[PDB]
């Protein structure tokens, strides 16, 4: 008995991360075990930590949380520093368009738990955390329940499967701040403080929770780890392009026939995501733009790019928000501006004032109330949110909007009128 959640459509061509999570219900431990679950953990505990880090490195697994950093290399940075060490699963997922993580958490929690246990063992962490946004209450309770199931089977607690490895997983909840998704801000919140990002470097792997070596990984990243152990790193690499290995979840939303989460290899193009898998657009209207969450804007001329972490790739979290020919780009830009207005933590002055002014000036532009000075101010503010910024939000708060100005000048000019 959990709080009500929507029925998010899910589809897979690889049958890995969504083997169970393609069905909208909670898969409990008995069902997970029947599908071969927790065997990868047992195999992992028979290996050395160093071997596991090596496999994850050689798999070429990259972070699924937006930045695309090599997971193995991240873990190696942590273990070069003396323990104790901490492992954190990041389940804050609060970016517009992004709902890929929740379907793993709510439908296949044991997949995530297995990955956390293996990952923790790899980096020598005896204490692990899941930080889940507060707007995912069912996920919180589902995880709490699944963790207790795992403990009763002896996959958590002391002396797991006679290995002598000890692990406890704690579930913490956010409270409505997107910034808590930033890894240093997340760590601050775990210490019981305001989610204020820290100056990086140092990176968490050097100094994290309680100033100790800490790895932070995205839910989706961690869900890959059982597969790498189970299949071996080489078989994992044969999934998808040689350069960008493994399954990837693509949350697709906006005006498509079949909005939902698609598990696809990263050699899939953006056009294929929308037309082949998502079924095309509602009313077969032409695609005007795709918003990569709140990070980037792609035009219709950019639909043939691969959904990978290459320089010319889609990148990000694979979030695909589709806008059709009828949808106003300025209106959409306003919504992105409003997002950053609401989410800036306020530590840095240009970010604090810039995010505010970007949204407020854009609102006036949208309502046809903007003076000529408002237009000049909007342009200036958009370009000056980043100075002095200590985290990624300040660096990207004007990125998507600037791209709309560059890619849709004709549409912006009508608001100039």
């Amino acid at each position: 008995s959990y709080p009500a959640i929507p029925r998010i459509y899910a589809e897979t061509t690889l049958n890995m991360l969504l083997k169970r999570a393609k069905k909208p219900r909670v898969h409990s431990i008995d069902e997970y075990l029947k599908d071969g679950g927790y065997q990868a953990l047992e195999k992992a505990l028979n290996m050395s930590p160093e071997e596991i880090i090596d496999w994850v490195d050689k798999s070429t697994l990259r972070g699924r949380g937006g930045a695309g950093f090599p997971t193995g290399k991240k873990w190696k940075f942590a273990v070069q520093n003396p323990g104790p060490r901490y492992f954190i699963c990041n389940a804050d997922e609060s970016e517009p368009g992004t709902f890929k993580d929740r379907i793993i958490i709510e439908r296949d929690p044991h997949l995530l738990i297995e990955g956390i246990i293996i990952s923790s063992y790899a980096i020598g962490a005896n204490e692990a955390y899941i930080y889940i946004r507060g707007e995912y209450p069912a996920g919180y309770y589902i995880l709490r329940d699944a963790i207790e199931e795992a403990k009763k089977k002896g996959f958590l607690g002391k002396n797991i499967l006679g290995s002598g490895f000890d692990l406890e997983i704690y579930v913490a909840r956010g409270a409505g701040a997107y910034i808590c998704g930033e890894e240093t801000a997340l760590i601050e919140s775990l210490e019981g403080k305001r989610g204020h990002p820290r100056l990086k470097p140092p990176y968490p792997v050097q100094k994290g929770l309680w100033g100790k070596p800490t790895v932070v990984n995205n839910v989706e990243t961690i869900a890959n780890v059982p597969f790498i152990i189970s299949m071996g790193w080489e078989e994992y690499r044969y999934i998808g392009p040689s350069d960008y290995a493994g399954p990837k979840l693509f949350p697709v939303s906006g005006k498509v026939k079949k909005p939902g989460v698609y598990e696809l290899p990263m050699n899939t193009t953006l056009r294929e995501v929308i037309f082949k898998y998502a079924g095309g657009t509602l009313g077969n209207k032409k695609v005007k733009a795709v918003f990569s969450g709140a990070l980037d804007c792609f035009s219709s001329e950019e639909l043939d790019i691969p959904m990978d972490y290459s320089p010319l790739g889609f990148g990000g979290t694979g979030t695909v928000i589709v806008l059709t020919e009828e949808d106003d780009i300025v209106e959409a830009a306003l919504k992105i501006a409003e997002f950053y207005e609401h989410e800036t933590c306020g530590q840095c002055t240009p970010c604090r004032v810039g995010c505010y002014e970007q949204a407020n000036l854009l609102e006036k532009i949208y309502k046809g109330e903007a003076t000529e000075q408002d237009w000049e101010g909007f342009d200036f503010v958009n370009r000056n949110i980043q100075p002095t910024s200590i985290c990624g939000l300040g660096a990207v708060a004007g990125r998507l909007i600037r791209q709309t100005l560059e890619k849709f000048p004709e549409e912006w000019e009508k608001y100039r009128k």
């Binding site: 009500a4 998010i8 517009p96 368009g97 993580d101 707007e135 019981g192 305001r194 989460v261 928000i321």
Partner: protein, 160 residues
């Protein structure tokens, strides 16, 4: 004019102690506690911070800064059920306006307002991570997609 000193009832206090004992350090439980308090009272009583701080073994100003930072925690208004309405993209394309209008029709209130009864408050929020099923809203912990005014009315009738 006189007011009674603030205490937590025993049922609520037990849950707060549970959260406080859950993590390795007490102060890590602060957000779980605040979530628990808000669901219990329908808001965060200003008086509640001092006793919470003592349980968390924190200075009051620390707790005050935390409550202020997370604006979702509401010290101003008391409401039994919080209707969180996604006002983000792409919900705006899929009919957030219709939902807001239907809410106004049924309950007679606009975003950020509380019913005179004091049972329902509409809170505008950013993306709820349910975008494929837009437009989206929550009633406390429960989450639903909006279809129609009659559909919305039936859902709301479940909260009393």
């Amino acid at each position: 004019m006189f007011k009674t000193e603030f205490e937590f009832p025993e049922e609520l206090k037990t849950k707060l102690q549970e959260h406080i004992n859950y993590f390795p350090k007490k102060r890590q439980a602060i957000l779980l506690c605040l979530h628990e308090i808000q669901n219990y009272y329908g808001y965060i009583p200003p008086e509640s911070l001092k006793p919470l701080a003592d349980m968390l073994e924190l200075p009051l100003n620390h707790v005050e800064g935390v409550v202020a930072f997370y604006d979702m925690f509401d010290r101003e208004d008391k409401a039994k059920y919080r209707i969180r309405v996604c006002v983000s993209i792409p919900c705006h394309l899929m009919g957030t306006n219709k939902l807001l209008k239907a809410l106004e029709n049924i309950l007679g209130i606009k975003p950020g307002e509380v019913t005179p009864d004091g049972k329902f408050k509409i809170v505008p929020v950013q993306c709820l991570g349910a975008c494929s099923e837009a437009p989206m809203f929550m009633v406390n912990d429960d989450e639903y997609k909006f279809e129609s005014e009659v559909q919305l009315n039936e859902i709301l009738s479940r909260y009393t």
